[PDB]
Amino acid sequence: TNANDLRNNEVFFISPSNNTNKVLDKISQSEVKLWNKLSGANQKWRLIYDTNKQAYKIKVMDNTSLILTWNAPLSSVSVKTDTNGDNQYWYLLQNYISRNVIIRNYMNPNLVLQYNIDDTLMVSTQTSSSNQFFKFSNCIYEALNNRNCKLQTQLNSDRFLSKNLNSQIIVLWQWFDSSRQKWIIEYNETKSAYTLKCQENNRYLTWIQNSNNYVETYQSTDSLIQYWNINYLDNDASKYILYNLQDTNRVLDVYNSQIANGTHVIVDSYHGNTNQQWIINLI
């Protein structure tokens, strides 16, 4: 799959190459360690690419916003407040075939991130050894791909993404365990994004471009209007935003932020308020 590619603005588990069941874990307010995989948000990391530097910040997703930092001139690493220090940027360089990634410090590119036998981490000069190879796994792909899901608006604990009765229009509706409210989330390799298939009619969540900008269930198409970048909210892994590929500045949104059964679901410009936030869970 290309779903685990080192994309800007994606959130990952970062594992040692020797153990896919251990992940980089922010254990405290400052310290990181490899730990048994538990999928708490303190084990999830957003990549933020800096094009000028051709290097990334690696930001924990537990709400603290702290970023992986080399404690220059020492050999230790930690999570720290982002002050845009050169020691807070990392080159992520990948072996295309093995999928292994080297995490190389920007301030001193002689130093790479290393995991130790005792699960601690540090920086060190480069060897040919596996203790400096990491694997990145996209969190959302791992969790949601090929799963039957429900999607709740953050506006209300009992309003869900629903195909309308006897219409293709998608609306909010209270839960009634209906196939109109169940969506198969499937990653498309070509588009590098997701489709969401309504269980009732086997048709897909699609932006219908006109002045209303409603979403409807629509037949399978290669057109970008049917494809969605499913992400966590910038600093909250408990909520999702869905950006449409036709215009990735626009997202799945609730008309006038209304909560009534029947409220139109639409695609509108990103602002990130609660009307654009969704809670996705497996059926």
Side-chain angles (χ1 to χ4, degrees):
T1 184
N2 64 44
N4 304 308
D5 290 359
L6 305 173
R7 291 185 182 85
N8 174 55
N9 201 21
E10 292 295 324
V11 171
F12 296 87
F13 297 114
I14 298 169
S15 293
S17 62
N18 77 338
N19 198 339
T20 189
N21 300 319
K22 283 182 175 168
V23 295
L24 181 69
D25 181 323
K26 176 177 172 280
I27 60 158
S28 72
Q29 267 332 304
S30 63
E31 306 311 305
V32 292
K33 191 170 195 161
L34 294 186
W35 202 258
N36 186 54
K37 195 171 189 178
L38 294 166
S39 295
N42 65 310
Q43 298 186 335
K44 297 183 169 174
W45 305 84
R46 190 180 295 283
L47 299 185
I48 304 90
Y49 187 68
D50 179 319
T51 295
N52 181 82
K53 294 178 162 42
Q54 298 183 239
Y56 300 74
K57 288 172 177 168
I58 304 176
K59 186 199 76 181
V60 72
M61 283 296 292
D62 74 349
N63 309 333
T64 66
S65 310
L66 308 179
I67 64 176
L68 190 67
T69 297
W70 164 44
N71 303 142
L74 307 173
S75 65
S76 59
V77 294
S78 72
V79 286
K80 284 180 90 76
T81 302
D82 183 1
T83 59
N84 294 289
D86 280 358
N87 55 316
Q88 302 190 292
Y89 290 91
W90 304 86
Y91 300 114
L92 301 176
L93 303 180
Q94 195 171 34
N95 179 322
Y96 177 72
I97 299 174
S98 77
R99 310 305 301 159
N100 288 331
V101 181
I102 294 186
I103 306 182
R104 182 177 303 275
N105 195 266
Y106 177 84
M107 180 180 275
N108 188 351
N110 289 327
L111 301 177
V112 299
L113 190 72
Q114 171 178 298
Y115 63 92
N116 297 314
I117 304 309
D118 65 3
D119 301 323
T120 68
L121 296 132
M122 68 196 323
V123 292
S124 161
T125 50
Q126 173 167 22
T127 52
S128 72
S129 53
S130 63
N131 71 356
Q132 295 172 350
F133 288 140
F134 294 88
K135 294 195 180 299
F136 282 63
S137 305
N138 184 286
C139 298
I140 287 170
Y141 182 85
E142 183 174 314
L144 304 183
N145 193 45
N146 294 316
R147 304 285 189 218
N148 195 21
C149 300
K150 55 185 178 199
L151 290 90
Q152 181 218 304
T153 174
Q154 177 58 24
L155 293 167
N156 191 281
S157 61
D158 194 22
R159 296 293 185 270
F160 292 82
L161 192 74
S162 310
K163 177 199 172 290
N164 203 59
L165 184 63
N166 216 53
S167 158
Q168 303 296 298
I169 293 164
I170 293 156
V171 301
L172 293 184
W173 209 273
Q174 71 185 83
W175 186 254
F176 63 109
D177 199 28
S178 175
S179 64
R180 286 193 276 115
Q181 311 183 290
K182 300 172 180 172
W183 301 86
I184 297 89
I185 296 179
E186 302 179 272
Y187 189 79
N188 179 291
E189 296 290 330
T190 312
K191 306 290 170 199
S192 298
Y194 294 88
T195 55
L196 289 88
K197 192 191 77 182
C198 183
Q199 175 192 301
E200 194 264 303
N201 69 351
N202 299 317
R203 282 153 64 86
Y204 303 88
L205 177 72
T206 307
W207 179 16
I208 306 306
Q209 296 189 283
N210 58 33
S211 65
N212 290 149
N213 289 305
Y214 300 153
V215 286
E216 296 187 17
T217 54
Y218 192 73
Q219 62 265 30
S220 186
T221 183
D222 288 334
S223 191
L224 300 169
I225 47 167
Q226 192 159 91
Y227 300 86
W228 305 85
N229 291 147
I230 301 171
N231 219 319
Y232 298 124
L233 201 45
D234 189 48
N235 209 43
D236 187 350
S238 77
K239 295 170 193 69
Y240 299 83
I241 304 290
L242 291 83
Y243 304 90
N244 190 278
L245 258 63
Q246 177 56 34
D247 181 346
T248 54
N249 294 138
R250 302 188 176 262
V251 304
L252 197 68
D253 200 348
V254 175
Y255 179 71
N256 287 169
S257 300
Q258 299 298 298
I259 60 154
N261 284 336
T263 300
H264 278 288
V265 178
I266 65 174
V267 171
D268 209 346
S269 286
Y270 175 78
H271 299 300
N273 287 353
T274 57
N275 45 297
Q276 298 183 344
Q277 298 173 19
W278 301 86
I279 298 175
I280 304 172
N281 278 289
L282 278 52
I283 295 310

